[PDB]
Design a protein around this nucleic acid. Structure first.
Ligand SMILES: [Mg+2]
Ligand SMILES: [Mg+2]
Ligand SMILES: [Mg+2]
Ligand SMILES: [Mg+2]
Ligand SMILES: [Mg+2]
Ligand SMILES: [Mg+2]
Ligand SMILES: [Mg+2]
Ligand SMILES: [Mg+2]
Ligand SMILES: [Mg+2]
Ligand SMILES: [Mg+2]
Ligand SMILES: [Mg+2]
Ligand SMILES: [Mg+2]
Ligand SMILES: [Mg+2]
Ligand SMILES: [Mg+2]
Ligand SMILES: [Mg+2]
Ligand SMILES: [Mg+2]
Ligand SMILES: [Mg+2]
Ligand SMILES: [Mg+2]
Ligand SMILES: [Mg+2]
Ligand SMILES: [Mg+2]
Ligand SMILES: [Mg+2]
Ligand SMILES: [Mg+2]
Ligand SMILES: [Mg+2]
Ligand SMILES: [Mg+2]
Ligand SMILES: [Mg+2]
Ligand SMILES: [Mg+2]
Ligand SMILES: [Mg+2]
Ligand SMILES: [Mg+2]
Ligand SMILES: [Mg+2]
Ligand SMILES: [Mg+2]
Ligand SMILES: [Mg+2]
Ligand SMILES: [Mg+2]
Ligand SMILES: [Mg+2]
Ligand SMILES: [Mg+2]
Ligand SMILES: [Mg+2]
Ligand SMILES: [Mg+2]
Ligand SMILES: [Mg+2]
Ligand SMILES: [Mg+2]
Ligand SMILES: [Mg+2]
Ligand SMILES: [Mg+2]
Ligand SMILES: [Mg+2]
Ligand SMILES: [Mg+2]
Ligand SMILES: [Mg+2]
Ligand SMILES: [Mg+2]
Ligand SMILES: [Mg+2]
Ligand SMILES: [Mg+2]
Ligand SMILES: [Mg+2]
Ligand SMILES: [Mg+2]
Ligand SMILES: [Mg+2]
Ligand SMILES: [Mg+2]
Ligand SMILES: [Mg+2]
Ligand SMILES: [Mg+2]
Ligand SMILES: [Mg+2]
Ligand SMILES: [Mg+2]
Ligand SMILES: [Mg+2]
Lengths: 91, 82, 200
RNA sequence: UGGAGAGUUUGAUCCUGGCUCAGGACGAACGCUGGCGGCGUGCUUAACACAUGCAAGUCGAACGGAAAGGUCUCUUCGGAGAUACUCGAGUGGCGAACGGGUGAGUAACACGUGGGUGAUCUGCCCUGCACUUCGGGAUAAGCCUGGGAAACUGGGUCUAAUACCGGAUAGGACCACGGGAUGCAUGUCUUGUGGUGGAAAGCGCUUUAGCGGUGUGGGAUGAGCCCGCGGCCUAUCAGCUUGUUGGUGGGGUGACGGCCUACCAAGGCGACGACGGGUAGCCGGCCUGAGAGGGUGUCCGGCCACACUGGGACUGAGAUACGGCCCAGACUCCUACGGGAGGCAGCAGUGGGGAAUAUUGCACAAUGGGCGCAAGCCUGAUGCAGCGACGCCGCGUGGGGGAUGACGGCCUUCGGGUUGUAAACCUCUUUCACCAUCGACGAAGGUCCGGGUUCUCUCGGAUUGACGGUAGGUGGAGAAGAAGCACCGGCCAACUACGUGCCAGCAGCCGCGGUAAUACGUAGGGUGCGAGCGUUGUCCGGAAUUACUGGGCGUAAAGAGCUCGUAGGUGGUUUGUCGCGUUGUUCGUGAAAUCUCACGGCUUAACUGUGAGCGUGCGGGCGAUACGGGCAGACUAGAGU
């Protein structure tokens, strides 16, 4: 199944994560199908970046994100837009 | 290892699939010998019996729908050209 | 590492004083060694090596750091020696020396290494730091009223101030308007020989 | 945006032409020396053999049962009771084909690149069209026995299922006949007619607790298959092939296909190097070089191949099936001699080889993966920590006055100077060390509660970090705790003396040492670098000494003894056509990191993030015929008669 997962490409003490769409049967830091954002858990609150339309297309086609990508999608509101929920932004 | 159960389920599958495949083979050879005999009367119903058995096996999943289609087409043309 | 050795011996070897200060001259000629009063044939490589060593011991730069500075300068477009000199000047110790907050480069390095300067209100302890445009430098609030600073607080008005830097009064703040121009301020050494040295 | 030369043939000179050197680089080793931190890297040789511990399990919201927990339960006063949460073991479902390792084999459609799949398959994911309807039989487990030293196993009962089988109906199963569109030939996409047929499953619920399965349309994802182009040496390997080449009819595959089979033809491959021998994982990448190029495939990333050696099948959507199975061989071990068990090229570690390369540590805190409705469980993947100067970066080992020209040493013309402002003496700072304290971001995160009824959201009560009481900050006296290394004749920066006298010796070349050695050992002095400096090993450059860039062949090495001619290369003038080479634009592709510009963050750098270049190419469409070229012509100058 297609999943949207976080890919870490930082150094030892800078765990930067990229919001990418990848196949489930792949390593964590592998060649994803398509990168659709990033997430830096080292700013004051955080750094969240979502394309919000390629993610929508993948969600409508069957891609299933994990728990942190799901939380980021809920934060950015794109998951709410896809599911029809009222609040389209909760940043 | 916790794979002795997998081995037992495997061998159960071997017996089941082997039995159904051998039954299908026997039905196929029965239809074939009827085809060379050229009765053209009981072969008409043997064709339907073989088709039913083979696509029943395909539904059971022991074979593929592609193989079922190939064999059904072969037996139908076999009945046809005589 | 650091030299931490006789600067005057190096000056006599290089035949060009480059530190000045209180101990500018030794009141004697320059036989750096036992045979230093004898004449030696001037080879082509000797001039370039002496120029490079003069620059390195003027700016307190190790060999590998100087190599990196030169390679960055030549890789940068335009000129090479001017860029190298600008990179050398952009050091914190050189900036403090030009702003007159220390007696010489060694004093500036001592203070910045011991951590008596906060550039953007942030503690630093590396002379290898490079300044940039619209960058402030300030003195530590606790470190004020200390002897090594109060000794020059009133006698820092002798040396000139470069045209790119500026100094502030009773409360010193150092700000960088733009990159320096060593070619027009304090160039006692020609870089066109270093650029030929480093291409061998 | 980028090009150094020097020495060495001679009595002296100019060429040619070798040999050596100055520079950089490494998964490095050695000699000496050796503080710390940030980030990386670390069996390159024996794909040699392995002690030992951990590396794949999960679901009671599928099922039968109750070994344990707390349990209301009879009560033994230490025994009872599945009905109850919960659950040992068992059935069943999924996972286990991913993840991790090595580079052995492999010169191959294995790899990179771009096409084709009208020749294809595809679980879990999304989603359109409908169903979710009836019966049967045994068994696991348990119980009673039996065999065997064990490993294991038999007989008799006994209980289920979302286990199995048999059913009704359901078009992308088939056959024959047709309609409708398409071209790229077999064909391709969709309906109709008649004859055939093909599955599902139930469970739970604090009552909107939720799960499910299949019959098929269409997406997403992964992969199977074919083709062109490119990436070693060797002809002292010149003839290779018979299922081999093709065709036909069957069989086989998910799928085309001599993939297999029966018959027919004689064909197919080869000097543009088949067949044979040696060597080798490929690529993005890494090093050197101004570049072209030369070397290389290690961190990391993509793929491929392998799992003691060799061979084979099954389950499954999907298997080199490392921690699955069967057999042959070797090795190791147990044995009652009849028989059995095993494979670290997973993590850690041991033996052996080598010049040589590391802990039998922590945690799922974060990410990814698997199992449920979950709560939750596992994960030597992963996040870290420990050892090594192994590599890059960065900071210290202090600083301000100092001619006491300390003393001395050294050289010595006996006058002097060198060591040398460095010192003593007066003083300033405490970077990193030592001691005590606070103390992290990493977690807009996950659980038990309050608005929300569950969908979405913030709120706080509690807790959750292996790293780690670590980073980092603060407070305390004290320069106090801290440097060494190589060379000094030319290449190439660095000279005097002592001892020695072809001896001791050094050395990259050529040259020094056989009694005034800047070349040997030593002392002083100097040069360069630095917690590193020299040697060794290999590659690039100098080398324009394999020359497209960028060489020559009268005498320095170099024209076959001459001629003919096969392939091949190359070709007069002019006209028209095509537009293959050529060139322009556009579109798709050319993964990421890494290379560069520009910025952003670790006090800076190393390190890292972002935007743009790079990706030299390829496929498709659309412009040109100026030159080469294909075709159709013409001319005589070339050439021939
Ligand atoms: Mg039989
Ligand atoms: Mg067929
Ligand atoms: Mg350093
Ligand atoms: Mg020469
Ligand atoms: Mg002569
Ligand atoms: Mg001669
Ligand atoms: Mg010549
Ligand atoms: Mg199981
Ligand atoms: Mg249980
Ligand atoms: Mg399930
Ligand atoms: Mg499976
Ligand atoms: Mg595997
Ligand atoms: Mg190895
Ligand atoms: Mg190999
Ligand atoms: Mg290809
Ligand atoms: Mg029984
Ligand atoms: Mg039916
Ligand atoms: Mg059923
Ligand atoms: Mg044949
Ligand atoms: Mg055939
Ligand atoms: Mg090999
Ligand atoms: Mg060259
Ligand atoms: Mg093998
Ligand atoms: Mg082994
Ligand atoms: Mg094998
Ligand atoms: Mg399966
Ligand atoms: Mg199967
Ligand atoms: Mg095998
Ligand atoms: Mg396995
Ligand atoms: Mg193993
Ligand atoms: Mg290991
Ligand atoms: Mg050895
Ligand atoms: Mg040994
Ligand atoms: Mg975990
Ligand atoms: Mg996780
Ligand atoms: Mg060492
Ligand atoms: Mg010299
Ligand atoms: Mg002597
Ligand atoms: Mg000597
Ligand atoms: Mg060389
Ligand atoms: Mg060359
Ligand atoms: Mg020549
Ligand atoms: Mg001659
Ligand atoms: Mg000759
Ligand atoms: Mg001749
Ligand atoms: Mg001859
Ligand atoms: Mg001859
Ligand atoms: Mg010819
Ligand atoms: Mg010709
Ligand atoms: Mg012509
Ligand atoms: Mg021609
Ligand atoms: Mg920065
Ligand atoms: Mg790229
Ligand atoms: Mg084109
Ligand atoms: Mg003529």
């Amino acid at each position: 199944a297609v999943k949207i997962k976080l890919t870490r490409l930082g150094k030892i003490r800078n765990p930067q994560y990229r919001v990418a769409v990848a196949d489930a049967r792949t390593r964590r830091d592998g060649r994803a199908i398509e990168v659709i954002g990033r997430y830096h858990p080292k700013e004051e609150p955080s750094l969240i970046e979502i394309n919000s339309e390629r993610a929508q297309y993948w969600l409508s086609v069957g891609a299933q994100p994990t728990e942190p990508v799901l939380k980021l999608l809920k934060i950015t509101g794109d998951w709410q837009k896809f599911k029809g929920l009222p609040g389209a932004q909760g940043r | 290892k916790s794979q002795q159960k997998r081995n037992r389920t495997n061998e159960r599958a071997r017996l089941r699939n082997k039995a159904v495949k051998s039954s299908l083979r026997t039905a196929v050879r029965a239809f074939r010998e009827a085809a060379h005999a050229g009765d053209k009367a009981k072969a008409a119903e043997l064709l339907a019996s073989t088709n039913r058995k083979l696509d029943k096996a395909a539904s059971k999943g022991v074979i593929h729908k592609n193989q079922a289609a190939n064999k059904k087409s072969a037996l139908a043309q076999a009945l046809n050209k005589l | 590492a650091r030299y931490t050795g006789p600067v005057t011996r190096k000056s006599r070897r290089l035949r060009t004083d480059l530190v000045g200060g209180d101990q500018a001259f030794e009141k004697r000629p320059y036989p750096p060694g036992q045979h230093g009063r004898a004449r030696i044939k001037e080879s082509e490589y000797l001039l370039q090596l002496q120029e490079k060593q003069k620059a390195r011991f003027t700016y307190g730069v190790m060999e590998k750091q100087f190599r990196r500075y030169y390679e960055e300068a030549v890789r940068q477009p335009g000129k090479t020696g001017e860029e190298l000199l600008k990179i050398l000047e952009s050091r914190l110790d050189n900036v403090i020396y030009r702003a007159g907050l220390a007696r010489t480069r060694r004093m500036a390095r001592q203070l910045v290494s011991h951590g008596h300067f906060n550039v953007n209100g942030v503690h630093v302890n590396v002379p290898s730091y490079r300044v940039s445009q619209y960058d402030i430098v300030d003195v530590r609030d606790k470190s004020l009223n200390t002897v090594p600073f109060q000794i020059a607080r009133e006698t820092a008005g002798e040396r000139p101030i470069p045209s790119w830097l500026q100094v502030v009064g009773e409360r010193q703040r150092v700000l960088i308007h733009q990159l320096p121009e060593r070619a027009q301020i304090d160039v006692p050494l020609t870089e066109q020989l270093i650029v030929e040295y480093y291409s061998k």
